Amino acid sequence: LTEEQIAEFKEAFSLFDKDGDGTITTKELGTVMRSLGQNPTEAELQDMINEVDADGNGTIDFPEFLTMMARKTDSEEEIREAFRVFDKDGNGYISAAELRHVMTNLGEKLTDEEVDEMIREADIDGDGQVNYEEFVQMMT
C-alpha cells in the first residue's frame, strides 16, 4: 500500500478521534455527524459502531476504522450530493476557495499550497478548477 494511503487513512481517523486518545466513541462519532448536518439517536451511534467493533469493547480503534472504510455501492447519488455540497455557488466548478471552506468544515486548517496541490491533483483538463467528472474521479 502507498506511503500515501498511510497519511491518508490516518487523517480520516483524525476526523473522528477528536481527543486523539486512539479510539472512536459514540460521542465523537456523534459530534462528527452533527457537523455534517445529521442528528443520529444514541441507538444509531452505538448501532453504527457495533457493526465494525471486532473486539466488542463498544469503541473503535484504528484497524476497526479500516474495517469501516473498506466495507461500504449506491455511490453516484451520494457523490452528486457531495459535489453539490462543495460547489457552494454551483457554477459547475469547485474552486480552491470552495475547497478551503470544505476542508475547514471538517477541521483541517490547510496550507494554501496543499489546497492548490489538491486542486492541481484532481484537475484533469487543467483549468484550475475541479468539475463534476474530475470530482467523480478525485472521489472514487
Binding site: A7, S14, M33, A43, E44
Partner: peptide, 22 residues
C-alpha cells in the same frame, strides 16, 4: 489530504447504511 472527505462520505453512507438496520 483527501483523508477527511473520504471519511465524511463513508460515515454518511454508514449512518443511512446502518440505519437501514432500524
Amino acid at each position: 489530504h483527501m483523508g477527511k472527505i473520504y471519511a465524511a462520505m463513508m460515515i454518511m453512507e454508514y449512518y443511512r447504511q446502518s440505519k437501514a438496520k432500524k
